[PDB]
RNA sequence: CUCUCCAAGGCUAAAUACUAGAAAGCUACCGAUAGAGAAGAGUACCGUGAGGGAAAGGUGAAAAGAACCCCGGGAGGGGAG
């Protein structure tokens, strides 16, 4: 389905997909200007990560299609998958130890020329 | 009774037990949770010490390891090879 000419992918980003998905829901299908404004405004780590990936996707589309400006572009699809995990130890009382997982996420954004 | 043997001195190869290993070979023996614990080692780690004891093999036929360009602080991705 993907026009892989027009897309950006960010692998192993430092946030959990459970925390990045809602921000993706708020910009899926919006216009590029509106999405960029939302991501700049909202002070969430996932918001900043999506901002980088979305800006890169728009840049790729513009570079390969010179007659496409920032205001014909809308964020067509947005996918947020889960990535590698790292386990570190958190020690507790009575010699008990717990493993403390750190999750990463993959982010895939495709833009498309507006309706 | 008869039949055998002649101690209280000292040696003796071979046939026999064994393979940590060395070389030459074999397997209706194993193929990475298997096989020695260990394809990387009694190392990492645990205990004052005696001692106990892991997990981790694979690009491609050849690095011929992605010139250069774009986004990004990078990472990474999108093109070009």
Tab-separated table of C-alpha atoms (C1' of nucleotides) in Angstrom:
chain	number	residue	atom	x	y	z
A	1	UNK	CA	0.000	0.000	0.000
A	2	UNK	CA	2.838	2.341	0.951
A	3	UNK	CA	4.258	4.847	-1.507
A	4	UNK	CA	7.604	4.330	0.182
A	5	UNK	CA	8.882	7.403	-1.684
A	6	UNK	CA	6.799	9.570	0.661
A	7	UNK	CA	7.392	8.075	4.086
A	8	UNK	CA	9.587	8.291	7.155
A	9	UNK	CA	10.498	5.608	9.655
A	10	UNK	CA	12.135	6.071	13.068
A	11	UNK	CA	13.363	2.892	14.701
A	12	UNK	CA	14.185	2.350	18.383
A	13	UNK	CA	13.103	5.646	19.704
A	14	UNK	CA	13.360	6.226	23.450
A	15	UNK	CA	9.729	6.065	24.514
A	16	UNK	CA	7.077	3.505	25.166
A	17	UNK	CA	4.476	2.825	22.466
A	18	UNK	CA	1.736	2.912	25.076
A	19	UNK	CA	2.740	6.525	25.703
A	20	UNK	CA	3.232	7.523	22.077
A	21	UNK	CA	0.023	6.118	20.572
A	22	UNK	CA	-2.432	8.760	21.919
A	23	UNK	CA	-0.392	11.593	20.435
A	24	UNK	CA	-0.481	9.738	17.126
A	25	UNK	CA	-4.271	9.472	17.375
A	26	UNK	CA	-4.547	13.230	17.780
A	27	UNK	CA	-2.792	13.936	14.455
A	28	UNK	CA	-3.814	11.016	12.261
A	29	UNK	CA	-5.523	12.378	9.183
A	30	UNK	CA	-4.969	16.048	10.054
A	31	UNK	CA	-3.321	18.547	7.767
A	32	UNK	CA	0.425	18.957	7.981
A	33	UNK	CA	0.250	22.472	9.408
A	34	UNK	CA	-2.232	21.475	12.093
A	35	UNK	CA	-0.236	18.377	13.016
A	36	UNK	CA	3.040	20.289	13.248
A	37	UNK	CA	1.393	22.898	15.448
A	38	UNK	CA	-0.080	20.223	17.714
A	39	UNK	CA	3.235	18.451	18.112
A	40	UNK	CA	5.128	21.673	18.801
A	41	UNK	CA	2.543	22.721	21.375
A	42	UNK	CA	2.028	19.518	23.300
A	43	UNK	CA	4.860	19.010	25.793
A	44	UNK	CA	5.200	15.233	25.564
A	45	UNK	CA	8.268	13.176	24.737
A	46	UNK	CA	6.208	11.251	22.217
A	47	UNK	CA	5.087	14.543	20.740
A	48	UNK	CA	8.682	15.587	20.083
A	49	UNK	CA	9.596	12.198	18.594
A	50	UNK	CA	6.596	12.276	16.266
A	51	UNK	CA	7.472	15.821	15.326
A	52	UNK	CA	10.880	14.726	14.087
A	53	UNK	CA	9.537	11.756	12.150
A	54	UNK	CA	6.664	13.732	10.575
A	55	UNK	CA	8.907	16.573	9.545
A	56	UNK	CA	11.289	14.087	7.947
A	57	UNK	CA	8.470	12.393	6.040
A	58	UNK	CA	7.240	15.705	4.688
A	59	UNK	CA	10.804	16.590	3.729
A	60	UNK	CA	11.174	13.363	1.762
A	61	UNK	CA	7.904	13.926	-0.061
A	62	UNK	CA	8.884	17.481	-0.957
A	63	UNK	CA	12.324	16.449	-2.144
A	64	UNK	CA	10.996	13.768	-4.453
A	65	UNK	CA	7.990	15.812	-5.642
A	66	UNK	CA	9.191	19.365	-6.126
A	67	UNK	CA	5.730	20.854	-6.743
A	68	UNK	CA	4.315	19.929	-3.317
A	69	UNK	CA	4.383	22.614	-0.627
A	70	UNK	CA	3.754	22.506	3.111
A	71	UNK	CA	0.036	23.247	2.715
A	72	UNK	CA	-1.047	20.492	0.284
A	73	UNK	CA	0.288	17.794	2.571
A	74	UNK	CA	-1.769	15.864	5.089
A	75	UNK	CA	-0.622	13.086	7.408
A	76	UNK	CA	-2.231	10.076	5.729
A	77	UNK	CA	-1.206	7.228	8.023
A	78	UNK	CA	0.662	6.911	11.312
A	79	UNK	CA	1.814	3.669	12.907
A	80	UNK	CA	3.596	3.164	16.202
A	81	UNK	CA	5.074	-0.245	16.896
A	82	UNK	CA	7.106	-1.583	19.761
A	83	UNK	CA	10.871	-2.049	19.658
A	84	UNK	CA	13.739	-3.584	21.586
A	85	UNK	CA	13.600	-3.865	25.369
A	86	UNK	CA	16.354	-3.584	27.940
A	87	UNK	CA	16.192	-5.045	31.415
A	88	UNK	CA	17.922	-3.475	34.400
A	89	UNK	CA	17.726	-4.348	38.052
A	90	UNK	CA	15.924	-2.420	40.791
A	91	UNK	CA	16.911	-3.765	44.219
A	92	UNK	CA	14.374	-3.827	47.031
A	93	UNK	CA	14.264	-4.818	50.667
A	94	UNK	CA	15.298	-8.177	52.127
A	95	UNK	CA	17.638	-8.902	49.244
A	96	UNK	CA	14.788	-9.077	46.738
A	97	UNK	CA	15.512	-7.813	43.258
A	98	UNK	CA	13.146	-6.810	40.479
A	99	UNK	CA	13.738	-6.474	36.761
A	100	UNK	CA	12.838	-3.095	35.323
A	101	UNK	CA	12.083	-3.144	31.606
A	102	UNK	CA	12.824	-0.181	29.329
A	103	UNK	CA	10.805	-0.099	26.108
A	104	UNK	CA	11.447	1.565	22.762
A	105	UNK	CA	9.130	2.229	19.843
A	106	UNK	CA	9.209	2.289	16.058
A	107	UNK	CA	7.340	5.103	14.351
A	108	UNK	CA	6.122	5.082	10.757
A	109	UNK	CA	4.517	8.131	9.159
A	110	UNK	CA	3.339	8.546	5.577
A	111	UNK	CA	2.137	11.848	4.206
A	112	UNK	CA	0.074	12.404	1.106
A	113	UNK	CA	-1.147	15.232	-1.049
A	114	UNK	CA	-4.386	16.610	0.335
A	115	UNK	CA	-7.793	15.781	-1.146
B	1	C	C1'	47.688	-97.341	57.418
B	2	U	C1'	48.657	-95.550	52.602
B	3	C	C1'	49.537	-91.987	48.789
B	4	U	C1'	51.920	-87.239	47.690
B	5	C	C1'	55.378	-83.189	48.936
B	6	C	C1'	60.339	-81.391	51.334
B	7	A	C1'	58.964	-75.121	54.583
B	8	A	C1'	61.033	-71.515	57.993
B	9	G	C1'	66.767	-67.704	51.542
B	10	G	C1'	66.150	-64.495	47.483
B	11	C	C1'	64.717	-63.120	41.791
B	12	U	C1'	61.787	-63.937	37.200
B	13	A	C1'	59.694	-61.769	30.977
B	14	A	C1'	55.133	-62.994	28.514
B	15	A	C1'	49.509	-63.786	28.733
B	16	U	C1'	46.576	-59.744	32.575
B	17	A	C1'	44.729	-54.137	34.728
B	18	C	C1'	44.753	-48.978	33.103
B	19	U	C1'	44.642	-44.087	28.951
B	20	A	C1'	45.124	-38.744	31.781
B	21	G	C1'	46.991	-38.393	26.776
B	22	A	C1'	50.028	-38.852	21.202
B	23	A	C1'	49.193	-40.306	16.037
B	24	A	C1'	46.345	-42.743	12.342
B	25	G	C1'	40.627	-44.163	11.658
B	26	C	C1'	35.412	-45.599	12.463
B	27	U	C1'	30.073	-44.715	14.053
B	28	A	C1'	21.586	-46.824	12.343
B	29	C	C1'	26.861	-41.145	17.929
B	30	C	C1'	25.612	-35.160	18.843
B	31	G	C1'	24.419	-30.427	15.458
B	32	A	C1'	23.963	-24.829	19.610
B	33	U	C1'	17.894	-25.803	25.743
B	34	A	C1'	21.945	-30.948	21.871
B	35	G	C1'	27.077	-32.221	22.252
B	36	A	C1'	32.719	-31.878	27.445
B	37	G	C1'	30.708	-27.228	32.365
B	38	A	C1'	33.097	-24.741	28.239
B	39	A	C1'	32.137	-24.187	19.313
B	40	G	C1'	34.017	-18.131	23.526
B	41	A	C1'	35.709	-20.853	30.005
B	42	G	C1'	35.888	-23.086	35.037
B	43	U	C1'	35.821	-17.158	32.357
B	44	A	C1'	31.742	-13.497	34.199
B	45	C	C1'	29.484	-13.819	38.846
B	46	C	C1'	28.393	-15.565	44.322
B	47	G	C1'	30.906	-16.755	49.232
B	48	U	C1'	35.959	-14.806	54.446
B	49	G	C1'	37.633	-19.410	52.685
B	50	A	C1'	37.034	-24.534	51.352
B	51	G	C1'	33.905	-24.261	47.169
B	52	G	C1'	29.896	-23.395	43.722
B	53	G	C1'	28.998	-21.868	38.724
B	54	A	C1'	26.393	-19.669	33.999
B	55	A	C1'	24.290	-17.369	29.323
B	56	A	C1'	25.970	-15.743	24.382
B	57	G	C1'	27.355	-20.153	17.046
B	58	G	C1'	25.217	-18.295	11.413
B	59	U	C1'	25.439	-11.175	6.486
B	60	G	C1'	26.946	-12.038	1.560
B	61	A	C1'	29.736	-16.348	-3.359
B	62	A	C1'	33.049	-12.313	-2.409
B	63	A	C1'	32.874	-5.968	2.436
B	64	A	C1'	32.546	-5.539	-2.980
B	65	G	C1'	30.866	-2.003	4.893
B	66	A	C1'	26.088	2.023	1.548
B	67	A	C1'	30.602	7.415	-2.798
B	68	C	C1'	27.437	11.390	-3.052
B	69	C	C1'	22.477	13.961	-1.822
B	70	C	C1'	18.008	15.162	1.497
B	71	C	C1'	15.594	15.311	6.860
B	72	G	C1'	17.994	15.208	11.761
B	73	G	C1'	22.660	17.659	17.008
B	74	G	C1'	23.184	12.600	16.293
B	75	A	C1'	20.977	8.043	15.898
B	76	G	C1'	18.026	6.638	12.155
B	77	G	C1'	15.293	6.927	7.700
B	78	G	C1'	14.267	8.395	2.679
B	79	G	C1'	17.256	8.549	-2.557
B	80	A	C1'	21.416	7.423	-5.452
B	81	G	C1'	25.115	2.982	-5.979
